[PDB]
Design a protein around this ligand. Structure first.
Ligand SMILES: c1cnc2[nH]ccc2c1
Ligand SMILES: c1cnc2[nH]ccc2c1
Ligand SMILES: [Cl-]
Ligand SMILES: [Cl-]
Ligand SMILES: [Cl-]
Length: 163
């Protein structure tokens, strides 16, 4: 584990992360997809062999010795707010299990269900709080990757508030 486990946020492509493993914002079918998923497909295409897995689960596939944890958040265009919220919490708990099993000291993670799966709503706080609930009991250094400068400021503030 990390010497002093931390949360950090960076505004850059998760495909260029400096961590020992990556979480993909996957689709259930292991398809190349869009956004984070397409960047992951371009960087680690070997990791999409038998990566298909249901909503609310995570499945790890190695690209060489580099682990890609395919985490399937709910599409809020299909789920109720209540059922979506349950599956989103579950996907992050499955990520925590995988990160623990792999024995990594660090992990790069996007905010699940906040892009094209958001059902047109701002889910920064919802997704981030489920991330914390899952990862708080792990000792890996967590680095959150986002696109938007306003999201970087809000994620940074939320991390600092707990410190
Ligand atoms: C691709 C993905 N995420 C990004 N954040 C800042 C620039 C950039 C490009
Ligand atoms: C957030 C972080 N990294 C990304 N790569 C491609 C899109 C995206 C969004
Ligand atoms: Cl970048
Ligand atoms: Cl998404
Ligand atoms: Cl983002």
């Amino acid at each position: 584990g990390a010497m002093a486990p931390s949360y950090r946020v960076k505004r850059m492509d998760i495909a260029k992360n400096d961590e020992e493993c990556v979480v993909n914002a996957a689709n259930p079918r292991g398809l190349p997809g869009d956004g984070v998923c397409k960047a992951v497909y371009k960087k680690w295409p070997e990791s999409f062999k038998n990566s298909a897995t249901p909503v609310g689960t995570a499945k790890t596939v190695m690209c060489g010795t580099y682990p890609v944890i395919h985490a399937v958040g709910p599409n809020f265009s299909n789920y109720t707010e209540s059922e979506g919220d349950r599956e989103l919490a579950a996907a992050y708990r499955e990520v925590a299990k995988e990160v623990t099993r792999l024995g990594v000291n660090s992990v790069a993670i996007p905010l699940l269900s906040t892009g094209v799966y958001s059902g047109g709503k701002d889910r920064l706080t919802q997704s981030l709080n489920h991330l914390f609930t899952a990862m708080d009991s792990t000792d890996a250094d967590v680095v959150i990757y986002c696109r938007d400068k306003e999201w970087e400021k809000k994620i940074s503030e939320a991390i600092q508030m707990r410190t």
